[PDB]
Amino acid sequence: WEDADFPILCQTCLGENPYIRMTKEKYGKECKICARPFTVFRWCPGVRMRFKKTEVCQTCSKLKNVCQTCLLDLEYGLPIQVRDAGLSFKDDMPKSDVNKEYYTQNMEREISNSDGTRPVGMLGKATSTSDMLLKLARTTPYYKRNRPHICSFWVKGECKRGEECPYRHEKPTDPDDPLADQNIKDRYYGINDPVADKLLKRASTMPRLDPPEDKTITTLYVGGLGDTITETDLRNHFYQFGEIRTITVVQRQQCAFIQFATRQAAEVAAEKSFNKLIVNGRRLNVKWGR
Amino acid sequence: PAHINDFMFEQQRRTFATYGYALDPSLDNHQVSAKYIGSVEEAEKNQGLTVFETGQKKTEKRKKFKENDASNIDGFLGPWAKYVDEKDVAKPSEEEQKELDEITAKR
Amino acid sequence: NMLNLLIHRKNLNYLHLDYNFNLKPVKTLTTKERKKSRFGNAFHLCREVLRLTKLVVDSHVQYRLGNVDAFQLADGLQYIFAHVGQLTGMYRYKYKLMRQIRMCKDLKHLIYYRFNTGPVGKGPGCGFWAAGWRVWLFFMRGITPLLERWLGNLLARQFEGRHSKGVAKTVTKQRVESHFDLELRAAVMHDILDMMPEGIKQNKARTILQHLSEAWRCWKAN
């Protein structure tokens, strides 16, 4: 059995009011992954929002570093597969019954020897947040998660409970959509979760700077410079990132053309700066010159 | 492990619930001032009125019935008096109905 | 309802408990079911106590329906309490009951042989049911903590499951010899074959134990 002090949850899922009232139940339910009994905490998210419940053990949380009910990552907040890929992690948690119960037992025994402060294992050795992860991250609280379900009655017409229909009396979503059927077990293990694939395709279609053909094209064109930048400022953007060989600050077009001394240095600089080199608030467009 | 007073927490919570703004609870080591968090402009325009504090509201209350003479055999609505501006049936209609049939078939 | 929910939760569909709390099979059961469907003294003590109370409350229902009489109710209750032995069959499961049973006989010989001191006859109409009632109430005072323990154990075992991991069963009377030999040859294996070795390679302790058993048979054969 687990025993906790509070949930460990996403701010989205925790609610809007600063003042929340929440109930605990000791040994209340069984972790859908750890398979063992847990303490279950239940809170009312907001006005006219479903009561939510912590749905995974505190150890099953600390292991993969997620929110015990929202299930999304704690820092960035993407599906577990996406975060794993962006951290280039390879999580080896067993699948079959006996092996998984055994692994859970020993992982719990070893997490007993912790400080309760940070995830155990590679989730400390993989906290180097890649710009892909930061780029996919949610920005404001998608609080549409906490509205109630779809009223089978009010979908057939029957929700004769007036306005109190226990579920959102709107149109039912077409079951063909990939974003419909995502079993909890897979969403925790990260094996074929449709939201992960859609978000990954979105991250693949997202703009990133393109590389040139020729090795000798070592002039990099930064578009959208503005006349509040200095040649020394463009340097400080591309100075310690390697070596720069020359800098042409074109004031007749508000752009720049940086000749470097190391191809990998300039490549890392410009790709890492792609539309996001925000110096004095200017959206520069890093590309390889002609 | 805080220990706070009881009438006050429920006062602030109900405030934030029914009015949408509340005296923010951050007890910061940098001395912040009393700032109404949430619907700040609502707190400004409503003068900070709490759901518990009596205040002037000309808001139209929904129309209800009142049959409180308990001698009529099928008369007494008493405390169970329905709201008069209420519907008499709850259902989805022709377009959403066929669409939901199509979805239940698609599933 | 509780006893039927128990029966049907264990998945014993071939049995049913009828309305006077008799348990009856509705098939002829093979061995596997004659075994799977044996019940304990908790189940049966609860069955028989409920049967006594149903007898009592149903005598009262007969009174209230108009079927009998005040006098027939009183004497029928006296009957019930005097003859718990021949109506329930409780003694089968907690045989200490005969304390109570013999007591309710002794009382009845008193009361009867003072009830019918004159023209009053040896017939049925004697219901002065205070004494036997008292007796079975004290019995129940005693039995409720016992049965609450036994039923708590049964329900736990039915909902959690029986613990076959660290049972650690005592050494009783059928395991005295087998245990003596367990511990004797554990001792011998500790003793030299690991603490006076230097037959380094493989100290052959599995063969010194063979010598030990044969020395014993040779002792016995002189």
Place this chain on the structure above:
Amino acid sequence: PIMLLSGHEGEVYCCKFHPNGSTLASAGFDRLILLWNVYGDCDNYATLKGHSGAVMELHYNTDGSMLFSASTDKTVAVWDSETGERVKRLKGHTSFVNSCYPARRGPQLVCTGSDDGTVKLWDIRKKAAIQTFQNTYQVLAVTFNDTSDQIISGGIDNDIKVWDLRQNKLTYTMRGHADSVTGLSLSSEGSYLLSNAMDNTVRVWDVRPFAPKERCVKIFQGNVHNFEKNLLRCSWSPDGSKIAAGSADRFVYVWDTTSRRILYKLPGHAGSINEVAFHPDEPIIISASSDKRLYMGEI
């Protein structure tokens, strides 16, 4: 040592010393008054009883012979520290009497601030009222002036008021605090008076025969208020050297009269600190907080 005291069931609102520096009195929501011995193990001997409402302010006499204690249930009470027993139940207050003050070194006389809209003057012997200055509204703290001839009070309208006991008019009104004043305490100078107010600022004033007509002297930053609006109280040191304040921030604030610097924001508490008590002899500090216990800090 830290010496945390416990044994109170609800918030403790008021804690103060024997003017001997011998015994400790604390009180709050639990409707009774606990006493302790300051030295040794800081142990508890006596418990006074009777007050039906919350004990909102306890106040000693200047010898330590009888105890004054303002209760929520419309009443003040004077008791015998000799016995702990009631001598007088000052009734007649038409609402919540929050603040009480016994006249020091004058005739035995009491000023009580209440939530009725009046300040009340009472004599202990007559079982009757002396004077009452109904300004308009609730008065939240009240203290005499060392002549026992002016009476100072602080409430919701932010203008600290002082009445002359003989002309019975608003003698001295002072202004400059942005929100409600919650605490007054006149130093043992008989001159300098300390004012806490939940607008996050503390002020110092001086009642004299002649003052600059605008006697807002020293100003310190740091105190807090929040959704609690608990009553916040201040004190001078025995020497007029350090000002101690509490706040709803769990930090005991110790400042100095001289340089107005932050000598301390001490943590250690769990709930809002409502009252800090200075030892009349020692560098001993006692914190009464809403975490249902007390602290005994040594500085």
Place this chain on the structure above:
Amino acid sequence: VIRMVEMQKDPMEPPRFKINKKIPRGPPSPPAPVMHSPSRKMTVKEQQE
């Protein structure tokens, strides 16, 4: 700031979960170093003995 309240336990409620699960025992602790004195030799004759 949140208000913890513990939910009532129903008196008449049997246990909820199956306790008896068996698994092999975990790995022990990191083996400690064997601090012996150096081994001596057994002649052929002793092993004969």
Place this chain on the structure above:
Amino acid sequence: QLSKQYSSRDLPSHTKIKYRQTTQDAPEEVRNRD
């Protein structure tokens, strides 16, 4: 993972510890003795 099973032999019994009294042999006397 605490069971609600129970045993006839785990009922409370002998719930007070006898201590060795003043004359029997208390650790004070044996501390003294020669």
Place this chain on the structure above:
RNA sequence: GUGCUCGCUUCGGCAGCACAUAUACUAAAAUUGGAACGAUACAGAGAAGAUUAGCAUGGCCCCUGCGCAAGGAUGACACGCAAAUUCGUGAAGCGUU
């Protein structure tokens, strides 16, 4: 909604005051998955020539029992190289420095 304003103030309303202060695993569902020792059929019982009593040990095997008692075929299961760190003589023949 209740009462009182020495409220308008008629006995229509309005107002003010007081009093009263936050239920709920929201579902009649809709889902989703596994067992019945039941058939079905196969299957088919330790030791040693034969016939048979048992008590144990081991553990990702259970079942009946309140059970730390007892029972379940001695409850079942438990055997084809159950080979592990590691060699050297004696002679001969052939080719080599």
Place this chain on the structure above:
RNA sequence: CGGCCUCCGAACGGUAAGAGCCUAGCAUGUAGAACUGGUUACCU
């Protein structure tokens, strides 16, 4: 003036043990559900 009047009934150990097989039950009643479209110019 004598009195002396035990007990009492049920279970287990005989009706093999097993793999498949397939369908009720019986359990679940959840968690989650989505977001756009930037480009070249001077001297031989």
